[PDB]
Design a protein around this nucleic acid. Sequence first.
RNA 1: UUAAUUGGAUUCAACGCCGGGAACCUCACCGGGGGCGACGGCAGGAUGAAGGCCAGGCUGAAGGUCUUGCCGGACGCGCCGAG
Lengths: 69, 122, 100, 124, 49, 55
Amino acid sequence: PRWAVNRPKDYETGRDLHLITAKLDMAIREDIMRLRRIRAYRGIRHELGLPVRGQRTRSNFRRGQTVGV
Amino acid sequence: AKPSYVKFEVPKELAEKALQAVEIARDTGKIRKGTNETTKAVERGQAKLVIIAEDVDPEEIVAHLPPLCEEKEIPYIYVPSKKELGAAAGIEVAAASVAIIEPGKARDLVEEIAMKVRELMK
Amino acid sequence: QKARIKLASTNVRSLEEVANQIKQIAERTGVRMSGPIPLPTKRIRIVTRKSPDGEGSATFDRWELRIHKRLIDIEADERAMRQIMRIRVPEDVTIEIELI
Amino acid sequence: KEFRYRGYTLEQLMNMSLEELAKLLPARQRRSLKRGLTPEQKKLLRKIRLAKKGKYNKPIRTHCRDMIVLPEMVGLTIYVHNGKEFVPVEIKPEMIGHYLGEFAPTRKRVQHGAPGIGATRSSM
Amino acid sequence: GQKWKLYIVKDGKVIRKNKFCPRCGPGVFMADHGDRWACGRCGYTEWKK
Amino acid sequence: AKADYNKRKPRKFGKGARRCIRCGQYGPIIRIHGLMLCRHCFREVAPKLGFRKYE
RNA sequence: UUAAUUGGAUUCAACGCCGGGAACCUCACCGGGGGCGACGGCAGGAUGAAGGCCAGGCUGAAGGUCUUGCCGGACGCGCCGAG
Ligand SMILES: [Mg+2]
Ligand SMILES: [Mg+2]
Ligand SMILES: [Mg+2]
Ligand SMILES: [Zn+2]
């Protein structure tokens, strides 16, 4: 069925495709690069390494070292 | 209209029936002043007693009622002065034409003076 | 040929008085009346915070309002129908009559 | 290396009815178009079409951050309010199907300073 | 001041340059837009000659 | 017109569509069984309405 | 940190608390645009106050303002007290 493939309604050809391994990786990278070129909000969030889907960042998502006073 | 417009003389009876016959009708009637407001009134025949004072200069907005006198019945009289014209019917300002429609108990004198003006000059 | 009467009030005693009056009216006449059936009570419960501000321990009020009900069936007899139509109920009792 | 959105060139996208185009956008945009445009978006679209016709040679400034980018808007420059100012956006073909507000950030990037008094248990 | 003119009025004949609204009666006057009848209160898209 | 710049929009949902009938406050409105009262106002008028604290 | 990231509460007895799960409203913050002075009086005002509008500019959008002229008839924040 067409609703089971992992890339339906392709952005370039418009068809329903299933990708594996290197082609899948390069397709995902291309999608993120497209978001970055047009300077969209999600592209900036990808560039800065910050949560993309609207999470709060004051409490969790902490990855670093303690800063003293 | 304006004293510098020779229409006829200044009868005392015309003033008596034009000025002293509205105070008894002011409390039992309506008043519509203003040349522009009355112009629509006379044009559609809304007015009933048109007392045209000779106080408005120049002959710009006043040269509309005499030209319209022959177009409708327009029972009209003339007023000598304006200062008490507004006081007689209206408010403490200078009045140019106080039109009263359907006055109360002001029929005999107004009708007689209207007939007198009809036989006087039209 | 039968009438159904529904009674509801927030005071039990007034409801009992009205029911007893209807019962006696039926008794003083030749007419069969199914006894007053007690329907389940309505409870309206509201729980609220007590303090106006938010400081201090949290404590709650539990307010409750109770509504009692009764059901009476009687056969339509004009001699008995007029009497129950003229009985006067207190202002805190609701009555409704229908013919089935 | 040209631009194609579902296998369609830019010209083919230009000569499409609004209903035809909505079948190619994602679900959210299709629903938004299916419910019609708000009056403010109607006025903005009128100004855009007037500019395309060769009239209205003035900057196009707007408050409508929720307007969906359409193919006929490609090539213009629009100033979208971000809360205190209008920032310029140059529409590229790959922006079809996105909201305008996606290109006008509302917050400034954060550069942390030294933690102050009360930032740790021992600093109070 | 005073705005009552542009109506062709001579010694005894009064005619109005500005017509009245067909929705209303006489006395009301339109503007002088020249493109169309402003009508003052109702508005008309007529392309007055 | 100048008066049009003082009238509010007639909303039908949201916190702005409901006010306490006794004090006019927005927010903590009790909507049970048609009551429209603040949690503050309901405490001090509950006995008059016939409510009681049985337990 | 920021244009603003509204404010109250700091041991038990502050921190899923203010019934606080805020897309608009809520809203108290930030950027921008409009509106409001019963009642007394002062300039003013039917030779028309105060007020309202077809189209078109300014504008995020707006008779809000201006352009263009059409309306309505008795009050009057341009000024002082007061609300
Ligand atoms: Mg909560
Ligand atoms: Mg929420
Ligand atoms: Mg909000
Ligand atoms: Zn309340």
